[PDB]
């Protein structure tokens, strides 16, 4: 309204609303996460079991 | 007042010629209607990003970077490297 003859505030708001999703998120971590978790968990479990066995020994 | 009324007349009907009537101005050669209304309306985008500011160039956000889901090669080397780093713990 402060721009009385903008003649583009309609167009600018149109582009703004139509650009509500410029793009999407990228949560592509769905098997890389699983593999990293598997490797880390197996290694850490081996470490913890080894530590407990060392404590017992 | 006559000096007020006459001033109002000469400053209104002539203001009509300048703005309130599309008669431009006879005293001034170039009309502002052929100068400001459209071309200088691009002056706003001349100071702005031309065909780009009102446009707001499409730039979709991209994906972040990751390991390409590669545990066949990166995992073993990572494990060996972390154990080597553990040698000075």
- Of B54, B75, B78, which is closest to A8 when you measure between CB atoms? B54
Give the chain A residue whose CA is nearest to the CA of B64.
Answer: A26
- Of B56, B66, B75, which is closest to A29 when you measure between CB atoms? B66
SS (H, E, C) B23-82: CCCCCCCCCCCCCCCCCHHHHHHHHCCCCCCCCCCCCCCCCCCCCCCCCCCHHHHHHHHH
- How far apart (Å, rounded) are the C-alpha atoms in residues A48 and B78? 19
Sign of the torsion angle spanned by Cα atoms B16, B17, B21, B24: negative
- What is the resolution of the experimental data for this entry, in Å? 4.2
Cα A33 vs. chain centroid, distance in angstroms? 11
C-alpha distance from residue B48 to each of A13, B36, B53 (Å): 17, 16, 6
- How far apart (Å, rounded) are the C-alpha atoms in residues B18 and B36? 13
Q: Compute the nearest-CA separation of A22 from chain B (Å).
A: 5
Cα B73 vs. chain centroid, distance in angstroms? 48
- How far apart (Å, rounded) are the C-alpha atoms in residues B78 and B72? 11
* Residue A28 CB partners (closer than 8 Å, separation 6+): B63, B66
Report how this structure was experimentally obtained. Answer: cryo-EM
Chain breaks after residues in chain B, where C lies over 2.5 Å from next N: none
């Amino acid at each position: 309204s402060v721009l009385k003859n903008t003649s583009v505030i309609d167009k600018i708001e149109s582009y703004v609303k139509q650009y509500k999703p410029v793009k999407i998120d990228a949560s592509k971590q769905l098997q890389v996460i699983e593999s990293f978790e598997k490797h880390a968990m197996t290694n850490a479990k081996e470490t913890e079991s080894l530590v407990s066995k060392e404590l017992k020994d | 007042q006559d000096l007020y009324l006459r001033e109002l007349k000469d400053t209104k009907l002539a203001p009509s010629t300048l703005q309130d009537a599309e008669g431009n101005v006879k005293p001034w050669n170039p009309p502002q209607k052929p100068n400001l209304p459209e071309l200088e309306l691009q002056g706003p985008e001349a100071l702005k990003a031309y065909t780009e500011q009102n446009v707001e160039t499409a730039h979709v956000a991209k994906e972040s970077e990751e390991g390409e889901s590669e545990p066949i090669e990166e995992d073993w080397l990572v494990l060996d490297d972390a154990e080597e780093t553990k040698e000075s713990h």
